[PDB]
Amino acid sequence: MVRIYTLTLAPSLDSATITPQIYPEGKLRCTAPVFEPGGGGINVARAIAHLGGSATAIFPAGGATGEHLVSLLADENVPVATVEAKDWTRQNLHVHVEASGEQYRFVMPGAALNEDEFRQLEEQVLEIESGAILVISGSLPPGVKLEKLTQLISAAQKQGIRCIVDSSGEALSAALAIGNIELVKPNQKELSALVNRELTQPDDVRKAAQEIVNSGKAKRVVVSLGPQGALGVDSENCIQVVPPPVKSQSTVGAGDSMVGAMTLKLAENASLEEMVRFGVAAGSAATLLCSHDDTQKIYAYLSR
Template sequence: MKSVLTITLNPAIDKTVIVDRFVVGGLNRIEPIPQLDPGGKGVNVAKVLKNFDVPVIATGFVAGKQGEHLLSSLEKRGIATSFIKVDGETRTNLKIVDKANKQTTEVNEAGFQVSVCDLDSLFNHLSRLYDHTSHVVLGGSIPLGAPKDIYQQLIEHAKNHQVKIILDADGEAFRLGVKAGPFAIKPNLYELEQFVDQKLPTYEDIEKAARNLICDYNIQLVVVSLGKEGALFITNESSVFADALSIKAKSSVGAGDSMVAMIIYSLVKNLALEELAIWSVTAGSVTASKSGTEVCSLEEVAASLDKINVKHL
């Protein structure tokens, strides 16, 4: 059986600290033991896929002692890794959880810088990994030194190896990546509006914009996240809206990555679009109901599927 490959070019150690009430410009005392987790979009997706018993390999770049810690943490979770080591130091992303206001503030470092040789090594490395890969998850920030079109290059390279890419990024990296025609994309509404350079106030407007992307760039699936409202799932043949669970949200960290992991799970299992929508939105909602960087399990998601409402557009 082929594996899912997650590519994280700029991973991080996520350091989560908890305060009673976060005071901007004031003194904040954290609870005694901060939580340290391997992070970055692809890494987070790999953690969730492991929970779902989907064969997964995490790859990308790592650097320094923080990178060694990240690899060790993933291996302790039973996640196979195949990262390229580069000079510098893997970044730390600070997540400040405000217990009183139930808000999480994120402070992310830029991370290490990669060279042309590092990028050449990545493409050669991926060529070997793709022989055993069915789907690829690509997303998150890009490291210093990488060209703005690196995702576009990676998507074109993956398509040459007949693997399906799911892109979850933002900004210029997303805009250029879309033009390479990945198999699926998962923008939020703001990111889609930025791409089409117009407001999309209704579901019909969102659906039309997504269908234009499908037509123009040969994308097979567009998932538009609407946050606590749910998400739209659009293919060339069908469109559905799935509302989110009614939950007491504790943290948005990892919710989108859980959705991506469940999209992959659903594709691997050949689920119909309506089922994919239900499973994916449920996964994001369950993770959002958890504290810090905790993510959903397959059992938790399955237990809440009947609470999701779906309608065809």
């Protein structure tokens, strides 16, 4: 089986905290935070670990927050390959409000990356063996030009590194610019922004996904549709997998869990069907990241 790496240009050390009520103006007294590994690629690696696989998380780490992030992944036995960054690893805030049961997620940009540190990350990426899979997942941190993302992906694929992209906005277009992307998982609004139009008609998602495949931009597009599952599109196939009529109770980690599952399936040369079903199983398992047991249970139902 082929090795899996992920790349998080904008990782975080997230603080999970609890407060009784949420209201403006007042000081909301929040419990001592529980630190959580943040960032697309990082969480893809974690989801892959949960699913019985192994993925090395490549990412910039700065300062004591970066160290803690590294340490958290070490304790989850997630292999890591870091680049030391000048700017300290930033912290997002996850607040659970006791009275309402609601969670609030304050998502700030990753720490800045200077040009040197990005080349250092590129260096790390280029050390990945041919045929190995790289998941580039998450936002683009300040300091990184969009063209550099494109350049990294070009450079990666020019070495037979099979690239999986999960991003948004200008970063998603940039990552997809050189084309020949193994797999891209936009959600609906990411697909909409990518293709640069509102997706209002029933077939708009499919057509946008097929366009991307057709233009050679991505070999596979999996448009994730939240509770509606995902629509996977190949040069050969177009499928929608919808999760079982269950829950959901949270959405946190849904995308990354799905991407991790699909990445494993990609690594295993699974079919589009298997890949998307497993993606939907893991994403949906996360909504109850994904546990192995929950994913397997959803996956068995989807495959029944």
